[PDB]
């Protein structure tokens with residue numbers, strides 16, 4: 009008697025719109041894809057495309073690229089580009105519109121996909137399990153709410169991604185998350201980004217860019233230094249060049265309460281004791297698995313660490329026929345990984361040859377101004393595992409930044425080796441054009457690459473990149489996981 | 497053997513000549529002498545302390561090209577909300593030229609400082625020419641009959657005089673200019689013919705383009721059908737498109753025949769197709785002869801020929817046993833990170849006593865036009881005639897930033913050339929923004945024998961122009977035995 013659908017994917021995400029499209033076209037199995045909304049926009053935010061196309065990195069980088077202009081219009085003067093530059097402030101209006109046009113360009117492009125592909129079905133609403141083989145689609149995350157559709161399936165994939173995490177404090181209602189920020193009407197004059205994640209730091213740089221003439225962006229981390237887990241030396245070099253943009257970072261400082269004001273402002277109590285009136289208060293304080301209202305309890309698939317769906321090597325949950333990927337698994341909160349995990353799922357089940365995604369030596373980026381590329385492990389972690397760690401480093405001020413007046417801007421490179429055999433463990437880069445370089449580095453590292461491989465390679469002059477192959481001498485080492493200056 | 501004044505003389509403070517001079521003077525402690533023709537950058541000799549790559553080469557070029565790119569990244573800002581008076585946006589050439597004369601004349605001072613701060617590495621200011629296998633005489637002028645200042649007595653000699661812009665070889669060449677005179681022009685040129693299809697005329701075509709005074713144009717001009725001889729076909733086509741966009745008339749199959757000054761001062765240019773047009777300037781970027789024609793290598797039994805290319809073996813050792821040559825005057829590969837690598841290999845050879853030969857192959861080049869290009873390895877065409885079964889992976893698109901910019905014609909082209917036999921990457925070719933940065937890290941993967949099966953099993957970075965290198969799994973076409981097909985005849 010078999011069954012009606014072969015698969016039903018919960019979430020039209022980076023991770024779900026791989027898994028479906030691969031099962032429907034490259035294995036011709038019947039697929040349903042459940043997602044809450046047609047196209048981007050409040051109040052559902054996340055749409056067809058996922059949380060990295062609508063309220064993700066696609067719109068993020070567009071606004072960041074716009075925010076890069078402030079610098080490049082300031083700098084221009086030194087190369088003889090004579091300009092008004094006495095009241096040149098931008099227009100947040102025309103950016104968000106042009107940004108929407110493009111997210112909306114993608115929103116309608118993916119619909120064409122369903123209509124024009126046989127065996128690939130859209131089902132609008134909230135997904136929810138009733139049993140191992142039954143996925144009820146409703147109007148609300150509420151379970152007493154109305155059954156729009158009832159899908160009958162052999163397999164269930166879960167790809168519902170993240171949802172940004174809240175402070176749970178007085179006046180927490182008056183603050184905003186990443187989502188809300190993409191759909192603000194004006195450019196906050198007085199601005200506060202809370203947190204120290206890529207989430208925040210990027211958004212600082214954005215808001216920093218679109219200031220009405222006079223007005224500011226305060227950062228706020230509850231710890232000592234911004235960007236937990238990144239290269240400590242790099243994290244510092246950033247906090248300075250952030251400072252030079254105008255961004256006032258503050259540290260070991262947490263809000264205690266917010267309240268709304270006379271003119272709709274937000275009065276903010278701090279942990280230190282100071283009180284200020286900002287126009288907007290962004291909580292960029294990480295994000296968490298969205299596994300609450302799927303009723304996994306009902307079908308009996310384990311969750312745990314902040315509701316993260318528990319999965320084996322191969323993305324298989326505690327019920328054999330249920331699977332999970334992307335951010336709800338909680339393995340890496342990224343777009344390119346959620347994809348890979350989902351492509352590996354189809355190769356495993358419908359594919360034929362079992363496979364599970366390789367989560368390490370993942371080249372990453374943060375689009376700060378100026379931006380960071382990092383792949384592999386920090387000297388801090390390297391010291392813990394490997395016998396002998398060697399640590400190369402170099403830093404310099406690119407040629408243009410002599411003429412450009414931005415004398416502070418500097419490029420910084422930090423390579424980390426296993427001295428046991430002279431193999432590369434991590435590569436950490438700050439400066440403009442970084443994340444472009446880390447990608448093609450990230451390939452060499454995947455193969456397995458020694459510092460001798462790097463310094464045995466002729467340069468591309470003149471570029472920021474060529475100091476990858478001009479780093480021969482180590483700056484210090486680690487033995488027993490303890491810092492040194494030569495091998496004893 | 498016999499006790500000499502210096503251990504090593506070097507003719508030219510080049511990228512090569514200064515790498516050799518320094519490594520010998522500190523890590524092997526020899527008494528080195530380095531000859532060059534002037535204090536600092538500028539006319540009439542241009543090339544100075546720091547080589548034909550810091551004074552009238554790569555460095556100051558790539559500043560001016562960063563300076564040109566701000567034309568695009570201004571009328572491009574408009575779409576991101578950057579409303580600004582673009583009314584009569586006339587850029588000041590003088591302030592860019594000013595800015596760079598300050599920057600170069602600081603690397604020049606910073607070279608003086610290392611010389612006078614370094615144990616027995618001496619600088620000698622003149623035209624250094626050979627007297628015998630152990631002698632180098634330094635004259636005030638390039639003419640042999642010119643006054644003598646020094647006569648260096650040495651065990652070894654090194655030739656690092658590099659290259660020199662080649663003449664057009666046609667009446668009216670006296671009225672033209674080269675790379676050299678361009679860096680030191682008083683005003684920016686209104687009507688500009690950039691003559692030649694080398695990477696140097698191309699890069700320089702943007703300079704006059706970006707910095708063209710209002711109501712002015714630039715024409716590129718070349719011998720053949722497709723500019724940048726020897727780069728990837730599909731790149732060279734797709735580039736010329738965007739030079740058109742940028743606002744450049746690329747007129748191929750053209751070659752000026754005669755030039756004659758006018759009344760105002762502009763240049764009246766008889767073309768090869770019986771055409772006549774007027775230009776305020778005419779810059780030739782047609783080639784680089786090795787620069788050996790006044791060193792008297794004949795006189796020391798050093799063998800020249802092949803344009804002036806000093807004849808050298810797999811370890812840089814010339815026809816004479818104590819004399820060596822490196823950089824552009826050798827005429828192997830004419831990049832700067834080669835001249836340097838040819839230098840420090842030469843010190844490991846002679847003074848190190850653990851010989852090493854410089855490798856000229858799988859060397860990543862890059863061209864700084866607008867947009868730029870990054871290329872390492874061999875072109876589809878060359879590779880199909882070395883291999884049973886080549887396989888051309890290809891991809892191209894418009895970025896996110898141009899989606900909203902307006903210049904939605906802009907593209908980022910990535911073509912991977914593999915040997916189908918074993919899927920090993922014989923060559924990568926890239927157009928578009930941030931290319932030369934990405935290729936540098938790619939040239940490392942290829943030097944480790946990169947296979948395609950490595951590229952598309954490495955997780956990507958979202959969202960980046962580069963990430964499309966790992967996205968390519970399906971080959972566009974193949975080349976079964978030197979002839980393009982559409983699938984392998986299996």
Ligand SMILES: Cc1cc2nc3c(=O)[nH]c(=O)nc-3n(C[C@H](O)[C@H](O)[C@H](O)COP(=O)(O)OP(=O)(O)OC[C@H]3O[C@@H](n4cnc5c(N)ncnc54)[C@H](O)[C@@H]3O)c2cc1C
Pocket residue numbers: 018019020021022023024042043044045053054055056057058059060061063064065068133134135136167168169170186207298301302333334335336340341342343344346347957958959
């Ligand atoms: C501001 C921001 C910037 C980012 N920048 C980057 C970056 O630069 N690079 C990078 O690699 N990663 C980035 N990320 C991370 C990346 O966006 C995510 O890791 C990725 O989108 C997760 O894909 P996914 O398959 O897990 O599902 P998601 O992308 O989260 O998609 C989930 C979607 O499925 C649907 N859905 C969700 N819940 C349910 C439910 N209960 N029932 C039914 N349908 C549901 C909704 O339509 C929702 O939009 C960023 C994230 C954010 C928030």
Ligand SMILES: Cc1cc2nc3c(=O)[nH]c(=O)nc-3n(C[C@H](O)[C@H](O)[C@H](O)COP(=O)(O)OP(=O)(O)OC[C@H]3O[C@@H](n4cnc5c(N)ncnc54)[C@H](O)[C@@H]3O)c2cc1C
Pocket residue numbers: 469470507508509510511512513531532533534543544545546547548549550552553554557622623624625656657658659675696787790791822823824825830831832833835836862
């Ligand atoms: C416009 C332009 C752009 C370039 N762009 C790039 C690029 O992007 N990337 C790249 O890798 N390469 C580039 N190059 C080439 C590079 O800059 C150098 O020319 C070369 O790579 C280094 O050669 P060299 O070591 O012989 O140096 P050179 O500088 O050529 O050494 C010779 C120097 O010695 C002196 N000298 C010359 N003749 C005599 C003599 N008879 N007696 C005494 N002293 C003498 C002069 O100062 C002369 O400059 C470019 C060149 C030009 C002209």
Ligand SMILES: CN(C)c1nc(NCCc2ccc3ccccc3c2)nc2c1cc(C(=O)N(CCCCN)CC(N)=O)n2CCC(N)=O
Pocket residue numbers: 022025026027029117118121347970971972
């Ligand atoms: C090969 N591939 C991975 C995909 N191809 C296509 N269409 C045909 C593309 C193509 C290009 C060159 C080819 C050369 C030789 C043979 C076949 C080719 C097919 N649509 C694809 C697609 C992946 C997808 C797809 O699902 N995504 C495409 C994301 C691209 C964003 N720039 C989102 C995802 N699931 O990861 N889509 C959706 C259509 C679209 N462009 O919106």
